[model samples]
Target: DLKNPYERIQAEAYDAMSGIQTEGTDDDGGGDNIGWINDGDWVKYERVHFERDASSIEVRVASDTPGGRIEIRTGSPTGTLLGDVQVPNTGGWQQWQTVTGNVQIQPGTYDVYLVFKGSPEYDLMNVNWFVFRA
Candidate 1:
């Protein structure tokens, strides 16, 4: 479970995933990152508690090729759309950057889903961590 205004929730901490892999991250705090992400791949974090409404979310990502978008949803991968974060190439797969996106969520606990969307030609991006802000 996670809490709103949460600290960095590691991308590899997902309860379930469709098509993704994990690799060591080069971010300040060394840890594993969710990698080999492709269009249609999705990751689920169980029971994220939002004590208060969250206005936005931040994602730490990296991409060697042109990146993609991460659709934030609740319940399932195709569930309610909360918001989407546009990921851009960061020179290298290990070169990390933080991206923010606006989201509208009420106070409650729900399963969070991060759905990947991008070109099917190659892997899209790598994720280090994500967090929701109050």
Candidate 2:
């Protein structure tokens, strides 16, 4: 099915979004509620089970700075790399958008890591949710 990803992982519930801890926040008008993220932060989403192979990874994120890279990893923060997605300056920190990247992974369940890398002085971006496509 070429629809929304069956597995939507909430960014706020990740193992951690290192540096400058952001409290649980929700959008006012039903927009994506996101969390605070900083440079060198690695947020891990656990137990992502896929019955079949996933073709791509999609993320709904926001950022006002120059932006950074979101590295998708398998197992651990330093595990097998699936793909890397770039997040651009979407106007503001609350300005939401979606970025997609193709990946090659097989059917199985594993922990996923979203490692954000950017300038140390700026907030990389805030992630609302991430999903895997067929």
Candidate 3:
């Protein structure tokens, strides 16, 4: 179990998955994509820390409640709506056994966020999103 301070965490993160790392490695496929530009052959942004580029961006996400979500947008502001993912409060935590999306990154600056707390008896959702590859 968590300590007194952190016990408030509802769903908590996946495995020891918490905080940000370098970039890519979302365990999806962002590694295959090109988000870094010169990191290698391709750029990718699988993890929230893995930010990249884009053009005429638009996001589509949905879950059960408002537990799990992420927000992104153009320019670089504290509050923008480029992309988002939402989950519900079903009283239990849930994670994507596997994630697959048709999103095609273009290489820019993508905003990232997450939610894993709130409500009692309601389910928990992990906002730790993964891109596609590496």
- Top candidate (lDDT): 1
Sequence-dependent TM-score of model 2:
0.83
Candidate ordering by TM-score (highest first)? 1, 2, 3
Residue 95 in candidate 1 has what lDDT? 91
Taking all chains together, each candidate's TM-score versus the true structure is 0.96, 0.83, 0.30
**CA lDDT, every model vs. true structure:** 0.91, 0.74, 0.28
Query: Tens digit of lDDT per residue, candidate 1, span 1-134?
Result: 35444677888998999999998877898989999999999999997888888888999999999999999999989999999999999999999999999999898899999999999998999999998887
Total clashes for model 1: 0
Q: Estimate, for each residue in 42-83, the C-alpha lDDT of model 3 and write its tens digit.
A: 112222322343322222122244443333332333334444
Report how far residue 63 has shifted in candidate 1, in Å. Answer: 0.1
Selected candidate, larger TM-score, 1 vs 3: 1
The collision pairs in model 1 are: none
